């Protein structure tokens, strides 16, 4: 479309990450605008499936979601160009010495910002399916934005090399293949655990299979050290066995915007 831009109007400067399917760079569109560039490593992924993410981002545009700016899809090395988030992923940020100094009022603010982005996705009739701290990005001004739309779908299917985050996925989605906005709410509850514990892995020392088995037996993570009851009740609401009895993202954004600290 008019999402295509000439290659020359993009200068790649600093390599930020390397995956099996390519690379992530910080760069510049036309000298002016600071951007992030995702590079497709040829042949590993299809070019079709690599761009599936961008095509979805074309239609998914909100303040609390990382914005697409453009693509380069005319010759071999395929680029996806987006809004740049200075602080990197929320997970990595929480584990850093800086994030480890970020107190509970601001942590609850983080989660509310994410609940807002998810309220949009809900309202837009989409699902994310890959909602975790690793897939949220932090700006200089400490704004949290939902990233990584590889597994995202419109309601009523998986991209190449995909892989669901077992420990973040609702049991009904694992066992019955039932991905809905309500399975994202489960994920959000796990994301809340990640925020309050400063980027700790879900179910410490437990294997994915132990997790799957334990959940079918009615296990939920016990209240975490230094996490107020009111916050744990919100997590608990997200992990309700019966999907239909889990809250809306509109409710979560409201209640978290409403928790004073």
Cβ nearer to ligand 1N1, comparing 98 with 241: 98
Cβ nearer to ligand 1N1, comparing 32 with 217: 32
Q: What's the closest the beta carbon of residue 66 comes to ligand 1N1, in angstroms?
A: 4
Q: Does residue 210 have an active-site annotation?
A: no
Q: Is 58 annotated as a binding residue?
A: no
Q: Which residues of 16-32 are buried (b: 16+ CB within 10 A; e: fewer)?
A: eeeeebbebbbbbbeee
Q: How far apart are CA 239 and CA 222, in angstroms?
A: 12
Catalytic residue among 92, 130, 233, 250: 130
Q: How far apart are CA 45 and CA 250, in angstroms?
A: 36
Gap sites in the chain (C to N > 2.5 Å), preceding residue numbers: 156
Q: How far apart are CA 114 and CA 31, in angstroms?
A: 31
Nearest of 87, 80, 99 to residue 27 by alpha carbon: 80
Q: Is 4 annotated as a binding residue?
A: no
Q: What's the closest the beta carbon of residue 261 comes to ligand 1N1, in angstroms?
A: 27
Q: What's the closest the beta carbon of residue 207 comes to ligand 1N1, in angstroms?
A: 27
Cβ nearer to ligand 1N1, comparing 90 with 235: 90
Using CB under 6 A as the criterion, which residues of the chain lie in contact with ligand 1N1 when the complex forms? 16-17, 24, 36-38, 53, 66, 80, 82, 84-85, 87-88, 137, 147-148
Q: Is 106 annotated as a binding residue?
A: no
Nearest of 71, 67, 53, 52 to residue 3 by alpha carbon: 71
Q: Which residues of 80-100 are buried (b: 16+ CB within 10 A; e: fewer)?
A: bbbbbbebebbbebbeeeebe
Q: Is 154 annotated as a binding residue?
A: no
Burial (Cβ within 10 Å: 0-12, 13-18, ≥19) of residue 59: exposed
Determine phi and psi for 45, rounding to 5 degrees.
-105, 150
Q: What's the closest the beta carbon of residue 175 comes to ligand 1N1, in angstroms?
A: 29
Cβ nearer to ligand 1N1, comparing 126 with 232: 126
Q: What's the closest the beta carbon of residue 184 comes to ligand 1N1, in angstroms?
A: 17
Q: Is 18 annotated as a binding residue?
A: yes
Is residue 88 a contact partner of residue 167, using CB atoms and an 8 Å limit?
Answer: no
Q: Is 17 annotated as a binding residue?
A: yes
Cβ nearer to ligand 1N1, comparing 85 with 144: 85
Binding-site annotation: residue ranges for ATP: 16-24, 38
Which residues are known to be catalytic? 130
Instruction: Please state the residue numbers annotated as binding site.
Output: 16-24, 38
């Amino acid at each position: 479309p008019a999402w295509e831009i000439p290659r020359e109007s993009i200068k790649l400067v600093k390599k930020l990450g390397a995956g099996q399917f390519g690379e992530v760079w910080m760069g510049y569109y036309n000298n002016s605008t600071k951007v992030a560039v995702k590079t497709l490593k040829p042949g590993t992924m299809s070019v079709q499936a690599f761009l599936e993410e961008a095509n979805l981002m074309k239609t998914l545009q909100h303040d609390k979601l990382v914005r697409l700016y453009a693509v380069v899809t005319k010759e071999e090395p395929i680029y996806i160009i987006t809004e740049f988030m200075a602080k990197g992923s929320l997970l990595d940020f929480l584990k850093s010495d800086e994030g480890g100094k970020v107190l509970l009022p601001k942590l609850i603010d983080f989660s509310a910002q994410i609940a807002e982005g998810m309220a949009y996705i809900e309202r837009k009739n989409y699902i994310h399916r890959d909602l975790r701290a690793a897939n949220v990005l932090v700006s200089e001004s400490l704004m949290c934005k939902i990233a990584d739309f590889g597994l995202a779908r419109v309601i009523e299917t998986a991209r190449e090399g995909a892989k669901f985050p077992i420990k973040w996925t609702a049991p009904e989605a694992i066992n019955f293949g039932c991905f809905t906005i309500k399975s994202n709410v489960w994920s959000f509850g796990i994301l809340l655990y990640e925020i309050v514990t400063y980027g700790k892995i879900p179910y410490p020392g437990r294997t994915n299979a132990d997790v799957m088995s334990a959940l079918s037996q009615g296990y939920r993570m016990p209240r975490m050290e230094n996490c107020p009851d009111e916050l744990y009740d919100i997590m608990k609401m997200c992990w309700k066995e019966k999907a239909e009895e889990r809250p809306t993202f509109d409710y979560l954004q409201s209640v978290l915007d409403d928790f004073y600290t």
